[PDB]
């Protein structure tokens, strides 16, 4: 039953996600790798389902077997609307995976300038380091994205 929700949240079947959670299917149902419906919704870029899942009380700081949150995925894959909705629903902006990588690190690395500003707005630690001691600035300088490096001083 919770399996159907994982598959439906991934597929973007907005209609089926509501029908399944009307039968009280586990909204924090994890797959083999530890991905919730909110992970699959954040990754594949389903805004309507992300909201519907969070309004039905989905763990916003749910983490996979490597410590990646839906915010990690949303930020990394240039999903501006989903990042905002997640952060509005109290998603740890300074969340770290098993590598020490943050939603800012990922957004910064792919050069999603709009998302970086939204993350900083909610108090994203700019000096936050990964396991290799790299900031979002270190990334921008190495990438040579001077537009992004300006925002992080």
């Amino acid at each position: 039953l919770g399996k159907k929700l994982l598959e439906a949240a991934r597929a973007g079947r907005d209609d089926e996600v509501r029908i399944l959670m009307a039968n009280g299917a586990d909204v924090n149902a994890a797959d083999v790798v530890g991905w919730t419906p909110l992970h699959l919704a954040a990754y594949w870029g389903h805004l309507e389902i992300v909201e519907v899942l969070l309004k039905n009380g989905a763990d916003v700081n749910a983490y996979d077997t490597l410590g990646s949150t839906p915010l990690h995925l949303a930020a990394h894959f240039g999903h501006l609307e989903i990042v905002e909705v997640l952060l509005k629903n109290g998603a740890d902006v300074n969340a770290k995976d098993d590598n020490g990588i943050t939603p800012l690190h990922l957004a910064a690395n792919r050069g999603h300038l709009e998302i970086v500003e939204v993350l900083l707005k909610y108090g994203a630690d700019v000096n936050a380091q990964d396991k290799f001691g790299k900031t979002a600035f270190d990334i921008s300088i190495n990438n040579g994205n001077e537009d992004l490096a300006e925002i992080l001083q």
Binding site: G34, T65, S68, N99, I101, D130
Partner: protein, 48 residues
């Protein structure tokens, strides 16, 4: 043929990556965890 490969039990879990050590020039053994980061993503198992 002669095939070298990990015994099944040492290549089943993502956490087994860190159990694998490589020898540096200075002679010290370095775990994969020291110089590598990992994350889950989606890709095709059959590209047409």
């Amino acid at each position: 043929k002669v095939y070298v490969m990990s015994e099944a039990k040492y290549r089943m879990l993502p956490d087994d990556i860190g159990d694998w050590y490589v020898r540096a020039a200075d002679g010290q053994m370095v775990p994969f965890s020291a110089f590598s980061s990992s994350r889950w993503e989606y890709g095709s198992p059959r590209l047409e």
